[PDB]
Design an enzyme around this catalytic site. Structure first.
Site, PDB file in Angstrom:
ATOM      1  CG  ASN A   1     -75.666 -23.467-111.275  1.00 13.44           C
ATOM      2  OD1 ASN A   1     -75.834 -23.258-112.251  1.00 13.44           O
ATOM      3  ND2 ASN A   1     -74.427 -23.801-110.669  1.00 13.44           N
TER       4      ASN A   1
ATOM      5  CG  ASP B   1     -80.772 -32.212-107.141  1.00 13.38           C
ATOM      6  OD1 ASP B   1     -80.584 -32.410-108.689  1.00 13.38           O
ATOM      7  OD2 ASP B   1     -81.523 -31.198-106.870  1.00 13.38           O
TER       8      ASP B   1
ATOM      9  CG  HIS C   1     -78.616 -30.697-112.474  1.00 14.07           C
ATOM     10  ND1 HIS C   1     -79.492 -29.840-112.352  1.00 14.07           N
ATOM     11  CD2 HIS C   1     -78.093 -30.688-113.537  1.00 14.07           C
ATOM     12  CE1 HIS C   1     -79.104 -28.835-113.260  1.00 14.07           C
ATOM     13  NE2 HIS C   1     -77.973 -29.355-114.122  1.00 14.07           N
TER      14      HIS C   1
ATOM     15  CG  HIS D   1     -83.323 -31.887-113.356  1.00 10.82           C
ATOM     16  ND1 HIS D   1     -84.190 -31.553-112.280  1.00 10.82           N
ATOM     17  CD2 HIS D   1     -82.361 -31.391-113.178  1.00 10.82           C
ATOM     18  CE1 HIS D   1     -83.541 -31.018-111.335  1.00 10.82           C
ATOM     19  NE2 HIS D   1     -82.196 -30.912-111.852  1.00 10.82           N
TER      20      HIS D   1
HETATM   21  O1  LIG Z   1     -81.034 -25.319-107.860  1.00 11.59           O
HETATM   22  C1  LIG Z   1     -81.331 -26.363-107.957  1.00 11.59           C
HETATM   23  O2  LIG Z   1     -82.219 -27.093-108.115  1.00 11.59           O
HETATM   24  C2  LIG Z   1     -80.135 -27.169-108.762  1.00 11.59           C
HETATM   25  S1  LIG Z   1     -80.368 -29.111-108.836  1.00 11.59           S
HETATM   26  C3  LIG Z   1     -79.003 -26.656-109.329  1.00 11.59           C
HETATM   27  C4  LIG Z   1     -77.988 -27.273-110.025  1.00 11.59           C
HETATM   28  C5  LIG Z   1     -77.172 -28.550-109.908  1.00 11.59           C
HETATM   29  C6  LIG Z   1     -76.044 -28.896-110.622  1.00 11.59           C
HETATM   30  C7  LIG Z   1     -75.882 -28.269-111.895  1.00 11.59           C
HETATM   31  F1  LIG Z   1     -74.968 -28.722-112.657  1.00 11.59           F
HETATM   32  C8  LIG Z   1     -76.447 -27.062-112.000  1.00 11.59           C
HETATM   33  C9  LIG Z   1     -77.540 -26.636-111.311  1.00 11.59           C
HETATM   34 ZN   LIG Z   2     -80.981 -29.259-111.111  1.00 12.78          ZN
HETATM   35 ZN   LIG Z   3     -82.075 -29.248-107.477  1.00  9.43          ZN
END
Ligand SMILES: O=C(O)/C(S)=C/c1ccc(F)cc1
Ligand SMILES: [Zn+2]
Ligand SMILES: [Zn+2]
Length: 217
Positions: free
Chosen positions: A170, A80, A78, A76
């Site tokens: 989040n 990470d 984001h 996805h």
């Molecule tokens: O909980 C997770 O796996 C992640 S990756 C949360 C997250 C990271 C960035 C965002 F903008 C929103 C949620």
């Molecule tokens: Zn995420």
């Molecule tokens: Zn994540």
């Protein structure tokens, strides 16, 4: 359980089987992906939080396995998952994603992955079979899972919470009314699972999918 760490302790790789390792990096917040050691090169599932960590991860695995990283599957958009995309593109590493993930990456200011993955895509790297599956919206609109049919290993990514997660995290980009159906779609497609790698936390089994369902109630 063979574990190997970088000199700083911010990057670790843990062996699941002969050719499958989990990579974990600290951004402290740990994040997991996979390293697939194939006859044609290394394939990663997910990069890492930023380009510095992605470079270090690539350099560690290329040195250890004595082959190049050729491909990465981005699950996805984001940080990470995709934060090292600039490093992948400048090194000629193919960054696979769905079109939606690529669109969201571009909207969020990241360089674009390939947008080549469909709802179900079957890849083969050397002898390693990899299936990507978009189960529906959940943690994000675009999240996919990755399945290794030769091992019945599921990379749940951030759609799947670890046992240590006591809430959904989040949810700003999440779809909490569709997330349960998306998990059920995973459970229906993959009825016999040996290991489930969550996006963050310890590797588990199908119980992590059931744990995520409970956190959605
Ligand atoms: O909980 C997770 O796996 C992640 S990756 C949360 C997250 C990271 C960035 C965002 F903008 C929103 C949620
Ligand atoms: Zn995420
Ligand atoms: Zn994540």
């Amino acid at each position: 359980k063979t574990v190997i760490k970088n000199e700083t302790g911010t990057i670790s790789i843990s062996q699941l089987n002969k050719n499958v390792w989990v990579h974990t990096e600290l951004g402290a917040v740990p994040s997991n992906g996979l390293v697939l050691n194939t006859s044609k090169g290394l394939v990663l599932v997910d990069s890492s939080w930023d380009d510095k960590l992605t470079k270090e991860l690539i350099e560690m695995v290329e040195k250890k396995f004595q082959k190049r990283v050729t491909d990465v599957i981005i699950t996805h958009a984001h940080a990470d998952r995709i934060g090292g995309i600039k490093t992948l593109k400048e090194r000629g590493i193919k960054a696979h994603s769905t079109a939606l993930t690529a669109e969201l990456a571009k909207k969020n200011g990241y360089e674009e992955p390939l947008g080549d993955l469909q709802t179900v895509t079957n890849l083969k790297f050397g002898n390693m079979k990899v299936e990507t599956f978009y189960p529906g919206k959940g943690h994000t609109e675009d999240n996919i899972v990755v399945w290794l049919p030769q091992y019945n290993i599921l990379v749940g990514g951030c759609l799947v919470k670890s046992t240590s997660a006591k809430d959904l995290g989040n949810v700003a980009d999440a779809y909490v009314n569709e997330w349960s159906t998306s998990i059920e779609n995973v459970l229906k497609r993959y009825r016999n699972i040996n290991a489930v790698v969550p996006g963050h936390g310890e590797v588990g089994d199908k119980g992590l999918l059931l744990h995520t369902l409970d956190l959605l109630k």
